[PDB]
Design an enzyme around this catalytic site. Sequence first.
Site, PDB file in Angstrom:
ATOM      1  N   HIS A  87       0.474  -1.314   0.027  1.00 32.97           N
ATOM      2  CA  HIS A  87       0.318   0.071   0.206  1.00 32.97           C
ATOM      3  C   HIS A  87       0.918   0.938   0.133  1.00 32.97           C
ATOM      4  CE1 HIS A  87      -3.419  -2.466   1.950  1.00 32.97           C
ATOM      5  NE2 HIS A  87      -3.632  -2.873   0.326  1.00 32.97           N
ATOM      6  N   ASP A  89       1.390   3.878   1.951  1.00 33.53           N
ATOM      7  CA  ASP A  89       2.517   3.852   3.133  1.00 33.53           C
ATOM      8  C   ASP A  89       3.039   3.001   3.505  1.00 33.53           C
ATOM      9  OD1 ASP A  89      -0.187   1.868   3.737  1.00 33.53           O
ATOM     10  OD2 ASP A  89       0.104   1.816   5.926  1.00 33.53           O
ATOM     11  N   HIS A 150      -3.539  -7.746   7.795  1.00 35.53           N
ATOM     12  CA  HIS A 150      -3.873  -7.106   7.096  1.00 35.53           C
ATOM     13  C   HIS A 150      -4.019  -6.573   5.638  1.00 35.53           C
ATOM     14  CE1 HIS A 150      -3.875  -2.234   6.278  1.00 35.53           C
ATOM     15  NE2 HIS A 150      -2.798  -2.676   4.557  1.00 35.53           N
ATOM     16  N   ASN A 181      -7.887   0.147   8.002  1.00 37.80           N
ATOM     17  CA  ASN A 181      -8.518   0.338   6.819  1.00 37.80           C
ATOM     18  C   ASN A 181      -8.584  -1.594   6.341  1.00 37.80           C
ATOM     19  OD1 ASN A 181      -9.089  -0.169   3.895  1.00 37.80           O
ATOM     20  ND2 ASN A 181      -8.109   2.206   2.954  1.00 37.80           N
TER      21      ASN A 181
HETATM   22  C1  LIG Z   1      -3.006   3.245   2.376  1.00 40.75           C
HETATM   23  C2  LIG Z   1      -3.557   2.130   3.251  1.00 40.75           C
HETATM   24  C3  LIG Z   1      -4.841   3.354   4.457  1.00 40.75           C
HETATM   25  C4  LIG Z   1      -5.360   4.912   4.067  1.00 40.75           C
HETATM   26  C5  LIG Z   1      -5.985   5.138   4.871  1.00 40.75           C
HETATM   27  C6  LIG Z   1      -6.651   5.149   5.737  1.00 40.75           C
HETATM   28  C7  LIG Z   1      -5.640   4.050   6.596  1.00 40.75           C
HETATM   29  C8  LIG Z   1      -5.027   2.984   7.834  1.00 40.75           C
HETATM   30  C9  LIG Z   1      -6.071   2.892   9.298  1.00 40.75           C
HETATM   31  C10 LIG Z   1      -7.025   3.646   9.479  1.00 40.75           C
HETATM   32  C11 LIG Z   1      -8.004   4.076  10.295  1.00 40.75           C
HETATM   33  C12 LIG Z   1      -6.563   3.407  11.428  1.00 40.75           C
HETATM   34  C13 LIG Z   1      -7.634   3.471  12.906  1.00 40.75           C
HETATM   35  S1  LIG Z   1      -8.321   2.624  13.488  1.00 40.75           S
HETATM   36  C14 LIG Z   1      -7.183   0.989  13.836  1.00 40.75           C
HETATM   37  O1  LIG Z   1      -8.836   2.943  14.878  1.00 40.75           O
HETATM   38  O2  LIG Z   1      -9.595   2.101  12.645  1.00 40.75           O
HETATM   39  C15 LIG Z   1      -5.756   3.287  11.206  1.00 40.75           C
HETATM   40  F1  LIG Z   1      -5.001   3.368  12.035  1.00 40.75           F
HETATM   41  C16 LIG Z   1      -5.040   2.776  10.037  1.00 40.75           C
HETATM   42  C17 LIG Z   1      -4.592   2.293   6.645  1.00 40.75           C
HETATM   43  C18 LIG Z   1      -3.993   0.576   8.247  1.00 40.75           C
HETATM   44  O3  LIG Z   1      -5.073  -0.013   9.011  1.00 40.75           O
HETATM   45  O4  LIG Z   1      -3.290   0.019   8.011  1.00 40.75           O
HETATM   46  N1  LIG Z   1      -4.121   1.871   6.224  1.00 40.75           N
HETATM   47  C19 LIG Z   1      -5.181   3.384   5.513  1.00 40.75           C
HETATM   48  N2  LIG Z   1      -5.048   2.147   2.466  1.00 40.75           N
HETATM   49  C20 LIG Z   1      -5.758   2.391   1.222  1.00 40.75           C
HETATM   50  C21 LIG Z   1      -5.775   0.695   1.028  1.00 40.75           C
HETATM   51  C22 LIG Z   1      -5.623   0.035  -0.058  1.00 40.75           C
HETATM   52  C23 LIG Z   1      -6.486  -1.061  -0.693  1.00 40.75           C
HETATM   53  C24 LIG Z   1      -5.953  -1.210  -2.574  1.00 40.75           C
HETATM   54  N3  LIG Z   1      -6.268  -2.508  -2.628  1.00 40.75           N
HETATM   55  O5  LIG Z   1      -5.960  -0.345   2.316  1.00 40.75           O
HETATM   56  C25 LIG Z   1      -5.298   0.815   3.104  1.00 40.75           C
HETATM   57  O6  LIG Z   1      -4.222   0.120   3.845  1.00 40.75           O
HETATM   58 ZN   LIG Z   2      -1.745   0.661   6.834  1.00 38.21          ZN
HETATM   59 ZN   LIG Z   3      -2.225  -1.198   4.278  1.00 34.31          ZN
END
Ligand SMILES: C[C@@H](c1cccc2c(-c3ccc(CS(C)(=O)=O)c(F)c3)c(C(=O)O)[nH]c12)N1C[C@@H](CCCN)OC1=O
Ligand SMILES: [Zn+2]
Ligand SMILES: [Zn+2]
Length: 232
Positions: A87, A89, A150, A181
């Site tokens: 991803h 990030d 994840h 996510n």
């Molecule tokens: C780029 C990334 C992405 C973007 C924006 C947010 C996140 C979050 C995220 C969200 C909420 C919380 C708070 S909480 C645990 O209390 O909910 C958190 F800590 C992390 C994560 C992750 O959880 O790592 N990553 C995100 N993306 C985009 C997507 C791509 C799929 C392509 N097939 O998937 C992904 O991970």
């Molecule tokens: Zn992430």
């Molecule tokens: Zn991710």
Amino acid sequence: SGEYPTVNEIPVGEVRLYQIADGVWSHIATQSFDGAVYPSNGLIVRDGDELLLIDTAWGAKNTAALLAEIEKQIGLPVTRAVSTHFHDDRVGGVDVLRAAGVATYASPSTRRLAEAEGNEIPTHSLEGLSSSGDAVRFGPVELFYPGAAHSTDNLVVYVPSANVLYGGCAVHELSSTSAGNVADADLAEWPTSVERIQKHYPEAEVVIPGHGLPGGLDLLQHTANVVKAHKN
Ligand SMILES: C[C@@H](c1cccc2c(-c3ccc(CS(C)(=O)=O)c(F)c3)c(C(=O)O)[nH]c12)N1C[C@@H](CCCN)OC1=O
Ligand SMILES: [Zn+2]
Ligand SMILES: [Zn+2]
């Protein structure tokens, strides 16, 4: 002024480093995604007179700012980077790294997923990580594939000199209320993958999540708990 920097304390485009242990830092940056702002972590590990980087700072400009912050605060060259899943990030900024002399690495799975989904692609493939429980050494760290969590490709990183476990996005911070996510997650397999981490690294002293505050080993159990409750 010394606490771990949180999302509202870092403007998008700026990077801060946080000293975790001797020769171990996290990096923290913030990015916008679908109209909300999120923090994210990576790792820096001293490798003699060089540095090993784990994960980009979530974007090209953030990753350029990361390199500048490293030069300001540490002053050793980043020679290698590992991305712990596909991803943005984790790999967004790989092109910046590759133009700044950094050799970029990821598993073949990560590379294939990044390519298929239009993300930036690390140059070098990390073999020896394709089965859950696999571990390989890479400079001053051990890379471990815990199984799908994840994402199907997520790797975790252990710094044996400091007993630092960098979970990446397979591990959530203690304040988390959901599994983040979950677009590419395997909620059914994730607890099993966390159990593998817990069994493999029982002496971890610091656990760093992919997003949010580091803590201790409780982050692993908390992650399992929130993932199970999310799935349900
Ligand atoms: C780029 C990334 C992405 C973007 C924006 C947010 C996140 C979050 C995220 C969200 C909420 C919380 C708070 S909480 C645990 O209390 O909910 C958190 F800590 C992390 C994560 C992750 O959880 O790592 N990553 C995100 N993306 C985009 C997507 C791509 C799929 C392509 N097939 O998937 C992904 O991970
Ligand atoms: Zn992430
Ligand atoms: Zn991710």
